[PDB]
Design an enzyme around this catalytic site. Sequence first.
Site, PDB file in Angstrom:
ATOM      1  N   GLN C 146      11.190 -14.587  -2.986  1.00  0.00           N
ATOM      2  CA  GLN C 146      12.692 -14.166  -2.807  1.00  0.00           C
ATOM      3  C   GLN C 146      13.264 -14.858  -1.719  1.00  0.00           C
ATOM      4  O   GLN C 146      12.875 -15.105  -0.855  1.00  0.00           O
ATOM      5  CB  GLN C 146      12.794 -12.795  -2.674  1.00  0.00           C
ATOM      6  CG  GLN C 146      12.550 -11.700  -3.849  1.00  0.00           C
ATOM      7  CD  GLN C 146      13.029 -10.350  -3.432  1.00  0.00           C
ATOM      8  OE1 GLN C 146      11.999  -9.398  -3.895  1.00  0.00           O
ATOM      9  NE2 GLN C 146      14.032 -10.098  -3.209  1.00  0.00           N
ATOM     10  N   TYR C 332     -20.551  13.109  25.983  1.00  0.00           N
ATOM     11  CA  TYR C 332     -20.963  13.565  25.152  1.00  0.00           C
ATOM     12  C   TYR C 332     -21.516  12.239  24.101  1.00  0.00           C
ATOM     13  O   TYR C 332     -22.596  12.204  23.459  1.00  0.00           O
ATOM     14  CB  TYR C 332     -20.389  14.460  24.079  1.00  0.00           C
ATOM     15  CG  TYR C 332     -20.244  15.702  24.368  1.00  0.00           C
ATOM     16  CD1 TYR C 332     -21.575  16.603  24.767  1.00  0.00           C
ATOM     17  CD2 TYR C 332     -19.132  16.787  24.352  1.00  0.00           C
ATOM     18  CE1 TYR C 332     -21.419  18.119  25.102  1.00  0.00           C
ATOM     19  CE2 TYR C 332     -19.003  17.901  24.807  1.00  0.00           C
ATOM     20  CZ  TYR C 332     -20.166  18.666  24.956  1.00  0.00           C
ATOM     21  OH  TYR C 332     -19.972  20.058  25.116  1.00  0.00           O
ATOM     22  N   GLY C 444     -21.426  26.082  20.189  1.00  0.00           N
ATOM     23  CA  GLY C 444     -21.442  25.815  18.651  1.00  0.00           C
ATOM     24  C   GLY C 444     -22.288  24.789  18.369  1.00  0.00           C
ATOM     25  N   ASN C 480     -18.642  19.306  14.938  1.00  0.00           N
ATOM     26  CA  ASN C 480     -19.397  19.272  16.256  1.00  0.00           C
ATOM     27  C   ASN C 480     -19.759  17.863  16.657  1.00  0.00           C
ATOM     28  O   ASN C 480     -20.337  17.142  16.103  1.00  0.00           O
ATOM     29  CB  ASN C 480     -20.402  20.270  16.395  1.00  0.00           C
ATOM     30  CG  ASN C 480     -19.902  21.475  15.970  1.00  0.00           C
ATOM     31  OD1 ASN C 480     -20.321  21.988  14.751  1.00  0.00           O
ATOM     32  ND2 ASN C 480     -18.861  22.239  16.460  1.00  0.00           N
TER      33      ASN C 480
HETATM   34  C1  F43 Z   1       8.304  -9.735  -7.352  1.00  0.00           C
HETATM   35  C2  F43 Z   1       9.361  -8.796  -7.395  1.00  0.00           C
HETATM   36  C3  F43 Z   1       8.887  -7.596  -8.383  1.00  0.00           C
HETATM   37  C4  F43 Z   1       8.191  -6.719  -7.405  1.00  0.00           C
HETATM   38  O1  F43 Z   1       7.437  -5.782  -7.598  1.00  0.00           O
HETATM   39  N1  F43 Z   1       8.725  -6.940  -6.090  1.00  0.00           N
HETATM   40  C5  F43 Z   1       9.441  -8.020  -5.922  1.00  0.00           C
HETATM   41  C6  F43 Z   1       9.272  -8.649  -4.655  1.00  0.00           C
HETATM   42  C7  F43 Z   1       8.921  -8.050  -3.358  1.00  0.00           C
HETATM   43  C8  F43 Z   1       8.644  -8.648  -1.931  1.00  0.00           C
HETATM   44  C9  F43 Z   1       9.279  -9.913  -1.981  1.00  0.00           C
HETATM   45  C10 F43 Z   1       8.446 -10.858  -0.967  1.00  0.00           C
HETATM   46  C11 F43 Z   1       8.297 -12.105  -1.154  1.00  0.00           C
HETATM   47  O2  F43 Z   1       9.295 -12.942  -1.464  1.00  0.00           O
HETATM   48  O3  F43 Z   1       7.187 -12.565  -1.005  1.00  0.00           O
HETATM   49  C12 F43 Z   1       9.233  -7.626  -1.006  1.00  0.00           C
HETATM   50  C13 F43 Z   1       9.612  -8.095   0.221  1.00  0.00           C
HETATM   51  C14 F43 Z   1       7.831  -6.466  -0.887  1.00  0.00           C
HETATM   52  C15 F43 Z   1       6.674  -7.087  -0.168  1.00  0.00           C
HETATM   53  N2  F43 Z   1       5.463  -7.245  -0.722  1.00  0.00           N
HETATM   54  O4  F43 Z   1       6.735  -7.372   1.129  1.00  0.00           O
HETATM   55  C16 F43 Z   1      10.255  -6.838  -1.764  1.00  0.00           C
HETATM   56  N3  F43 Z   1      10.301  -7.370  -2.958  1.00  0.00           N
HETATM   57 NI1  F43 Z   1      12.237  -7.191  -3.913  1.00  0.00          NI
HETATM   58  N4  F43 Z   1      13.176  -6.908  -2.347  1.00  0.00           N
HETATM   59  C17 F43 Z   1      14.404  -6.884  -2.140  1.00  0.00           C
HETATM   60  C18 F43 Z   1      15.562  -6.834  -3.119  1.00  0.00           C
HETATM   61  C19 F43 Z   1      15.262  -7.022  -4.480  1.00  0.00           C
HETATM   62  C20 F43 Z   1      16.229  -7.388  -5.401  1.00  0.00           C
HETATM   63  C21 F43 Z   1      16.888  -8.841  -5.003  1.00  0.00           C
HETATM   64  C22 F43 Z   1      18.148  -9.193  -6.037  1.00  0.00           C
HETATM   65  C23 F43 Z   1      18.937 -10.340  -5.330  1.00  0.00           C
HETATM   66  O5  F43 Z   1      19.874 -10.606  -6.400  1.00  0.00           O
HETATM   67  O6  F43 Z   1      18.546 -11.139  -4.495  1.00  0.00           O
HETATM   68  C24 F43 Z   1      15.623  -7.542  -6.875  1.00  0.00           C
HETATM   69  C25 F43 Z   1      15.697  -6.204  -7.833  1.00  0.00           C
HETATM   70  C26 F43 Z   1      17.078  -6.317  -8.126  1.00  0.00           C
HETATM   71  O7  F43 Z   1      17.500  -7.187  -8.967  1.00  0.00           O
HETATM   72  O8  F43 Z   1      17.701  -5.279  -8.145  1.00  0.00           O
HETATM   73  C27 F43 Z   1      14.266  -7.672  -6.381  1.00  0.00           C
HETATM   74  C28 F43 Z   1      13.197  -8.040  -7.194  1.00  0.00           C
HETATM   75  C29 F43 Z   1      11.728  -8.337  -6.774  1.00  0.00           C
HETATM   76  N5  F43 Z   1      11.055  -7.867  -5.630  1.00  0.00           N
HETATM   77  C30 F43 Z   1      10.892  -9.298  -7.714  1.00  0.00           C
HETATM   78  C31 F43 Z   1      11.136 -10.680  -7.275  1.00  0.00           C
HETATM   79  C32 F43 Z   1      12.650 -10.974  -7.467  1.00  0.00           C
HETATM   80  C33 F43 Z   1      12.720 -12.497  -7.555  1.00  0.00           C
HETATM   81  O9  F43 Z   1      11.871 -13.175  -8.458  1.00  0.00           O
HETATM   82  O10 F43 Z   1      13.488 -13.191  -6.879  1.00  0.00           O
HETATM   83  N6  F43 Z   1      14.025  -7.013  -5.004  1.00  0.00           N
HETATM   84  C34 F43 Z   1      16.873  -6.371  -2.927  1.00  0.00           C
HETATM   85  O11 F43 Z   1      17.685  -5.991  -3.463  1.00  0.00           O
HETATM   86  C35 F43 Z   1      17.204  -6.410  -1.257  1.00  0.00           C
HETATM   87  C36 F43 Z   1      16.289  -6.012  -0.454  1.00  0.00           C
HETATM   88  C37 F43 Z   1      14.808  -6.736  -0.748  1.00  0.00           C
HETATM   89  C38 F43 Z   1      13.627  -6.408   0.023  1.00  0.00           C
HETATM   90  C39 F43 Z   1      13.369  -6.967   1.497  1.00  0.00           C
HETATM   91  C40 F43 Z   1      14.288  -6.125   2.371  1.00  0.00           C
HETATM   92  O12 F43 Z   1      14.675  -5.073   2.256  1.00  0.00           O
HETATM   93  O13 F43 Z   1      14.418  -6.898   3.409  1.00  0.00           O
HETATM   94  C41 F43 Z   1      12.472  -6.828  -1.086  1.00  0.00           C
HETATM   95  C42 F43 Z   1      11.168  -6.080  -1.161  1.00  0.00           C
HETATM   96  C1  LIG Z   2       3.099   5.205  -6.964  1.00  0.00           C
HETATM   97  C2  LIG Z   2       2.004   5.600  -6.107  1.00  0.00           C
HETATM   98  O1  LIG Z   2       0.838   4.499  -6.328  1.00  0.00           O
HETATM   99  P1  LIG Z   2      -0.282   4.588  -7.289  1.00  0.00           P
HETATM  100  O2  LIG Z   2       0.177   4.385  -8.618  1.00  0.00           O
HETATM  101  O3  LIG Z   2      -1.099   3.258  -6.932  1.00  0.00           O
HETATM  102  O4  LIG Z   2      -0.888   5.807  -6.931  1.00  0.00           O
HETATM  103  C3  LIG Z   2       2.378   5.518  -4.625  1.00  0.00           C
HETATM  104  N1  LIG Z   2       3.012   4.374  -4.101  1.00  0.00           N
HETATM  105  C4  LIG Z   2       4.590   4.143  -3.996  1.00  0.00           C
HETATM  106  O5  LIG Z   2       5.001   5.536  -4.314  1.00  0.00           O
HETATM  107  C5  LIG Z   2       5.137   3.177  -3.753  1.00  0.00           C
HETATM  108  C6  LIG Z   2       6.310   3.473  -3.123  1.00  0.00           C
HETATM  109  C7  LIG Z   2       6.802   2.292  -1.920  1.00  0.00           C
HETATM  110  C8  LIG Z   2       7.230   1.128  -2.623  1.00  0.00           C
HETATM  111  C9  LIG Z   2       8.226   1.203  -3.633  1.00  0.00           C
HETATM  112  C10 LIG Z   2       9.528   1.376  -2.900  1.00  0.00           C
HETATM  113  S1  LIG Z   2      11.121   0.928  -3.980  1.00  0.00           S
HETATM  114  S2  LIG Z   2      11.766  -0.584  -3.163  1.00  0.00           S
HETATM  115  C11 LIG Z   2      10.959  -2.386  -3.878  1.00  0.00           C
HETATM  116  C12 LIG Z   2      11.829  -2.744  -5.013  1.00  0.00           C
HETATM  117  S3  LIG Z   2      11.913  -4.226  -5.355  1.00  0.00           S
HETATM  118  O6  LIG Z   2      12.107  -5.250  -4.162  1.00  0.00           O
HETATM  119  O7  LIG Z   2      10.507  -4.613  -5.707  1.00  0.00           O
HETATM  120  O8  LIG Z   2      12.641  -4.487  -6.624  1.00  0.00           O
HETATM  121  C13 LIG Z   2       0.901   5.769  -4.002  1.00  0.00           C
HETATM  122  O9  LIG Z   2       0.525   6.774  -3.471  1.00  0.00           O
HETATM  123  O10 LIG Z   2       0.530   4.375  -3.388  1.00  0.00           O
END
Ligand code: F43
Ligand SMILES: C[C@@H](OP(=O)(O)O)[C@H](NC(=O)/C=C/CCCCSSCCS(=O)(=O)O)C(=O)O
Lengths: 246, 548, 548, 442, 165
Positions: C146, C332, C444, C480
């Site tokens: 991203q 211990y 214990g 223990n």
């Molecule tokens: C691979 C995913 C799918 C997944 O399961 N998680 C991702 C990626 C993951 C990675 C991205 C790190 C990296 O680039 O290596 C992290 C940081 C989580 C981590 N593993 O540390 C994250 N998202 Ni995501 N992710 C975010 C967001 C978003 C927004 C970004 C929209 C835009 O127009 O830029 C969209 C979801 C949406 O469309 O609403 C989104 C998607 C996605 N999110 C798409 C990748 C999008 C893309 O191809 O560019 N995140 C956000 O909306 C803002 C906060 C931001 C998080 C990092 C932070 O909070 O600083 C990050 C939170």
């Molecule tokens: C869902 C369950 O994982 P499991 O199915 O492996 O048990 C559970 N994990 C979670 O609830 C994960 C919550 C924290 C990560 C997701 C927070 S939402 S914010 C990311 C959105 S995006 O940037 O990717 O679009 C756990 O117990 O590890």
Amino acid sequence: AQYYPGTTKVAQNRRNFCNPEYELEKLREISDEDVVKILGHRAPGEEYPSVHPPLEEMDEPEDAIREMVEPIDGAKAGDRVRYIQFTDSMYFAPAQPYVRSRAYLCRYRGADAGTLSGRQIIETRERDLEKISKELLETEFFDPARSGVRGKSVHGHSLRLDEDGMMFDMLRRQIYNKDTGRVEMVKNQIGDELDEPVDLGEPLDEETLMEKTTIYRVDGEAYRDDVEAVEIMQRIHVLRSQGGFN
Amino acid sequence: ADKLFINALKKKFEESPEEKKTTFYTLGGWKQSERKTEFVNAGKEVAAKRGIPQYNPDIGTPLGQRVLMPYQVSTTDTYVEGDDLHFVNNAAMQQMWDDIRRTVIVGLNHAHAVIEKRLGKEVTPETITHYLETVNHAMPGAAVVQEHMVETHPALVADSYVKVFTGNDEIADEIDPAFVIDINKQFPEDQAETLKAEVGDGIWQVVRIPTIVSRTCDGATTSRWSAMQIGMSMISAYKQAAGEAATGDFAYAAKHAEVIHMGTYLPVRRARGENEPGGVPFGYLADICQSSRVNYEDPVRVSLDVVATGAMLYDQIWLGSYMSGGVGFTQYATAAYTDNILDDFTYFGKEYVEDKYGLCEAPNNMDTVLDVATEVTFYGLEQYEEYPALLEDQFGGSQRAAVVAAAAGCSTAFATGNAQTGLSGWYLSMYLHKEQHSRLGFYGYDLQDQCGASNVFSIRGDEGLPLELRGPNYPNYAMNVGHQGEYAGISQAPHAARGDAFVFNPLVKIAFADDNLVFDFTNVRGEFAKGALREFEPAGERALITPA
Amino acid sequence: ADKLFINALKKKFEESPEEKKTTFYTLGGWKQSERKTEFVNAGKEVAAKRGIPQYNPDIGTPLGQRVLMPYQVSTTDTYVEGDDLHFVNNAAMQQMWDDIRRTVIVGLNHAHAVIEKRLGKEVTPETITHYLETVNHAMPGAAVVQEHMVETHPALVADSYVKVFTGNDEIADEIDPAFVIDINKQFPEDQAETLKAEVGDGIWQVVRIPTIVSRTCDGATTSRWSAMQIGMSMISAYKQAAGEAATGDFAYAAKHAEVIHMGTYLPVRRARGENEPGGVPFGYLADICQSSRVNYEDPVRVSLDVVATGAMLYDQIWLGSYMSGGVGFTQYATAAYTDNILDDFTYFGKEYVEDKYGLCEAPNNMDTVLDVATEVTFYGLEQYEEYPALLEDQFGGSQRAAVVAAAAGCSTAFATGNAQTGLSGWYLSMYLHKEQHSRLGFYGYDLQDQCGASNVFSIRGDEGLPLELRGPNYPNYAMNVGHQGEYAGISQAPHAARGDAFVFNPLVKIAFADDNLVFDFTNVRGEFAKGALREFEPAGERALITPA
Amino acid sequence: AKFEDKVDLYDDRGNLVEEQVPLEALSPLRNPAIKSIVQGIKRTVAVNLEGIENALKTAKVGGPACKIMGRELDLDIVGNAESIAAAAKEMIQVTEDDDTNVELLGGGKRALVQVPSARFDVAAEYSAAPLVTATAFVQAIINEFDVSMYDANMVKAAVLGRYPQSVEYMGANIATMLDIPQKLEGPGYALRNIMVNHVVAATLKNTLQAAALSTILEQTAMFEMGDAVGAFERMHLLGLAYQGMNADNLVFDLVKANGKEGTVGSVIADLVERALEDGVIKVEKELTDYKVYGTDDLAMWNAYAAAGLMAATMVNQGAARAAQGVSSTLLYYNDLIEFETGLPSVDFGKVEGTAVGFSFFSHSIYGGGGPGIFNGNHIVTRHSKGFAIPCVAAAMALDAGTQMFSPEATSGLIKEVFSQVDEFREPLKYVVEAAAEIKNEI
Amino acid sequence: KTAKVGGPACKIMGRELDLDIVGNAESIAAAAKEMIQVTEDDDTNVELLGGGKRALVQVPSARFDVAAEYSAAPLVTATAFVQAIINEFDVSMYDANMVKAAVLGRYPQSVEYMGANIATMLDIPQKLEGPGYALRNIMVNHVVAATLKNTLQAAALSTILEQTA
Ligand code: F43
Ligand SMILES: C[C@@H](OP(=O)(O)O)[C@H](NC(=O)/C=C/CCCCSSCCS(=O)(=O)O)C(=O)O
Ligand SMILES: [Mg+2]
Ligand SMILES: [Mg+2]
Ligand SMILES: [Mg+2]
Ligand SMILES: [Mg+2]
Ligand SMILES: [Mg+2]
Ligand SMILES: [Mg+2]
Ligand SMILES: [Zn+2]
């Protein structure tokens, strides 16, 4: 079916994208080869890879539901499930994320649609995905300046447009040609260079963007002035509230 | 006056904030950023020293095709790149969580009953002071009975101590004041009377164990370590046999019968013991934050200091590390405590309510929810539409949804004086936003949001709970960013508009009114800025025991 | 020759170790000790700084009416006061635990199958090496997909990385050796062939998340953090859509279907998630210790290095902090790793068995348990009766019970080649010792000890298990001190006598054969000395982001 | 009868079986077949005799990749299965002619065990099934081969795994459709912690029977949780009948009308037409070219909308023969229908909410997985009170082979043993028969 | 009446509700019995004690023969009393969640019914040290209280529950 309340152009455009009887306006012609290249899943002349054998080869037990439900062509073949993903600018792109998933599940069979703020995706069997993709790319679902085909690095829905009127793309997959007034796709949706670029036509001018957009904004039609659409949202809220209680 | 976010948008971008167009791709990628440049250089240095590649700006996609922005920490004049707000890079954020994790509240009510009724000895302020002197030697890890004990180094554990409080002023004033949280000194008069009325003649300890131990171990260590050293100090200060039958009543009292954990333990899929973030209910998080006793004239400031406390802890450390990890969720949380954006929206809504109803005057019903949450939702959304720089700043839809709905839900609860209607206004906000823009948040953002309206006023087993009692383990809330810290702000909102001293537990409120903490809970956003500047001094380090 | 503990006893006391009388009360109490004097001075400085009394040598009873002893760390020539072996004061002990807590092993075998089958793409040494360059950027908390991500400071997270191993030499030899734990280089040829045959063509990641994150959070963070950044690096290195249905199969594989936690989660009374000490089975602890691959010609040295690893982790950090706290349980544990005492006893037993039976060639039965465990129990006890300085050194009965029974149980398993008859010999030692001296341990101590004989060979639901599978959550063992690390030593003992490359899990053994760890697992007692001398450099510190 | 509603019940071919059955004849609290199914699920264990033998021969006990060199024991368990099973049965039963069943499968490589119901009537919960089964087989193997006191603990490890060091039976060679009581997300959740792939494997991928078994288990948990007590009872019973029991052939007829060319949206249009035709909903108000529908019976609207949701899943994921899009159907069927009508979606938004998080956790890096590994106790999919997971079961029954974590991968032991039980395999048939039998007792 | 819900020392100012539950105990109990029973005249028992201050509730056996475990007792009881209290006083949608909190406590944010005003001799299934342990998690003081400190009857009740587990 009625699809959506409201009396604005935005409302009527939301209903038109949902309604399979509404003929989506075709804006541009793209060849089959070029849809395959923009998808990026297989090379021109590569057979469809399979994830399982053809249904006919499977010999399945009696199931009334399977018997009643016709498989799409790529399901009969055993095709991989692949995707196409679009990003829509909040600066009046014609389609927008929930409009897409709502419309896809009224128009298309066997569809896994997902909505997010910055991207919207459909995944289905590969040969069928190529047929739906032609329609998503050649019609008013798509504008080559305010919408982008992007399988990763999707940032830009909420960004300011550049000086050509194009949405931001970290990977610059769509390039506006000053000499033609047209956009070319130069990379596929995952960002790999195409051997030859694909003509995507001219961006829609501002009047036609305003005619065809499905986003509500203070500088277009405001949602708060579509009082009938707000009334049904508020109704939903209140009815779910009271239902959850008693 | 200008919208409160204008200054920040003028700092971030060359264009005026209303300008619709810009130019990208000309900033040199990561080379535009001082912090990315420091990271590139440090990755080269780390990889060369250890012999394994590490940070490399050419892996994957090239950051900084657009402006990598500074962020103003709201209520401050500090502007930092967002990496300085990642919890890993911010010692104030780490210490805020260590100070919560390492705290427990432990009554002396049952313990003094055991001493009077079972040991047949008197308790007076004087015997309490002797016990406090003894437990402040023992609590950091030092001996009182046995021969040949080996002990913690007092300077590694200088942050551990025990204080007490009681609502009896004359008893409080008799105990040595080194050990006393003085309710009348820390709280304005009306709140002090409310808190002393709740506590009465009860006497409670606030026990903080060492940060180095909390970091080595976990939150479920805290009530055990506390009870061990309470137990030793009851032996030494009241002349018990060193281990007799009555010793087990002090153990059961300190570990179970009169303990207040900060967090309750979690179910197995997310297994954790006590004093971890997921167990902290939203009303306790509002009580831990101390903005209520300082900024009580301004209920918006109190509510949004609680939203900052909670967005950082719940989204950055809890959801973004305990429950996931990696680069994590810095900006999902920073949207709620930067650029004065949520502040602009929530002052608008407070003023709207002041004018239409008066704080706390509105009828507590759905009509008020529909009026206030709709009006404030549309205000917030119009700001993103009027100001293209604001929409490019809060570029993720989830960030916008959380910020608009927090202002709508806080404003609804300023109108009604009741956090449940505040919560219904948060859900209606999401529904209106989704239909306005044809988008909301990330793929999974509105799981709780679509369950939300029906579960606000449900009374069923795992559905019905007043908002103050909900937390990160309420089922619908257990997974997703952009809600939990905002819900702690909604839980604070009606209580700040009412002028109530606390939201859900008066013991928790008092227990953080203490300048002996390492983090200053009266000014959470100020502390986040100090940590971002690399100016906060945490506890727990090993410098004294490692090479110079 | 002198017994192995004589050098240490001569260093401790002025008398020769056989002398029966001494003088007490003339050493000036705490003033005899350099370390106590440093603590008194620090206490006064801490109390003044913060305005609350803290360490004070005049509270409670006066330490040092007898000699406050130095301890030799066994196998070293390092002598330190026992306070330098308390885990709070010893950064090597803290790091040993962080290096375990922050590690997880995660297969690539389902992942590579998802790529070939669902995606229809190839996997080769080349695409693995690309994936490993990507995940070694991402794992410490840096971005790959991203725009506008904010990241961890590389230097704060320089201890986090991903390596791989496989039994397939031809894939192993072709990846950049930077990423590979090379079984052939790390293990002697016999052990390497056993380990490569166990692994076969499987490919496994060893993921280490940052120590600063593990300290801020908990053990249950590790496998989640690992999976997030494996998931990002799978998307970036193999060109998935960034979030499609197949992405969920990589998450389920990395979090559940092909993960190996170091510890499993605990029941609610001692609620904790994964990768906490109570969940680590004894067989794993023996496999984490790397003495087996260096000291294999000396089964006693391998077994007692496992006992040191386990006594420190299980008694000092786990039971003495996670499960209690305070001054805790340093000595211990140090009884099992200082003054070469357990070494003298265990080398006696090893010689007894090698002369009478030959290693592993005694019948695996109760006759062998009775012979060997009784003979080695009476040897160890006789040393306390012949050397009054040894008895005053290991002054607590529990210390002596653990040391004598560890030598008896290890020597029994050196005879039978089977840990279960080793365990039966541990229990018999306790019953003999209790009758010989008319005491055993603390109030214990022998809960498990009296349940012990009956539960060694039971098959019932919560009773029956091979020793290698038991751990700190086996019901009888959950409370223990003075048992769990010694049981890890007994679990190692027959495997070291047999020449086995591992005790219970080959993946765990290989996963710690890595000089990029911060702690050196091949020489646990040497590291404990280095930490005691303040010469060990831990990871995780915040100095880079705090003022000068 | 507390409620006046009646329903018509059909078989899984769409033929009528019984007309005008009172709604409570389908209640878990009254229907004796649902009682038999639930007690069956509590008492049935699959024993993998081959897996026990192989774990002993290699000393690979205690969980993935674990092994104890030198502890190998080579025992001819499968070649002596009949004797081992008979000796286990005499310890498992209470009396000789009770309802204990021990039946060899696969040439003695597996055993179906049903522990006698009576052990459960004097137990607090359901763990007696695996714990009584496990010890009876550990003791029968030790006694068959006269395994010594020194080696017997390895048999116990091969059968039950690393328990009690681990909380679960980690590495066990027995399996149940239930999971341990400590893993419940709340009290009352045990009938929800049953993997969707286990329900699809037990029902041999017959779509209607998978959806019925899943609904029976989910709505029976709703009673145990107290959700179906008082105000909500009729809503839950109508959901059970119309979404899981194909009441009035509503699901069936919707699928028939939309199966050749239909979409989620065509199913919606048909269901709204059907609800109007039956008087369940009516136009309340006209806006501008838009009818606002109302109902005087929210429980019945919710049930009709639930039947449509199931049918939409069957149409949508049946056309793809790929289960992944069930998360999308469960979201947009409910989002579209509320804007189509002005009425609340199924479970008053909680299906739609479950579907938003289920979609994210089946297409993202953070957790979840493919559809078949979810269940009503999973944090992602616990939120709807029985109206979402049965659709996931139908969708995985219709998957033609797109999943890595398929029922073949996760649930083979369960499939061999639990599909043998007629009431687990074909519950639609037995529950409807029992409802017709007790029809005059309500 | 005090808004003291959700666990030790907890209170929500402004949420107080003054309801005459003990004065209307008979009507509330009967309304809860009607939800708790399966059929009229089955083995459901709802009996007031202490002039309406307490109720002994025995949930019908049939709900357990169609349950996996035993939590239907507290969950069915709690919700029938929450709904009967709401219906007795016509508590509004806005306030009814406080009835829920006063009955069942901080669940589900807490795993236990923390601050509940109902009690059982059994404890929740999550707290079992091993599968099969639920009849063991019964406090010794509960056994001695139920048997009125008759020595042989307390020993008998404890042995029955232990050996049944
Ligand atoms: C691979 C995913 C799918 C997944 O399961 N998680 C991702 C990626 C993951 C990675 C991205 C790190 C990296 O680039 O290596 C992290 C940081 C989580 C981590 N593993 O540390 C994250 N998202 Ni995501 N992710 C975010 C967001 C978003 C927004 C970004 C929209 C835009 O127009 O830029 C969209 C979801 C949406 O469309 O609403 C989104 C998607 C996605 N999110 C798409 C990748 C999008 C893309 O191809 O560019 N995140 C956000 O909306 C803002 C906060 C931001 C998080 C990092 C932070 O909070 O600083 C990050 C939170
Ligand atoms: C869902 C369950 O994982 P499991 O199915 O492996 O048990 C559970 N994990 C979670 O609830 C994960 C919550 C924290 C990560 C997701 C927070 S939402 S914010 C990311 C959105 S995006 O940037 O990717 O679009 C756990 O117990 O590890
Ligand atoms: Mg054409
Ligand atoms: Mg106006
Ligand atoms: Mg200060
Ligand atoms: Mg080294
Ligand atoms: Mg070193
Ligand atoms: Mg009309
Ligand atoms: Zn920690």
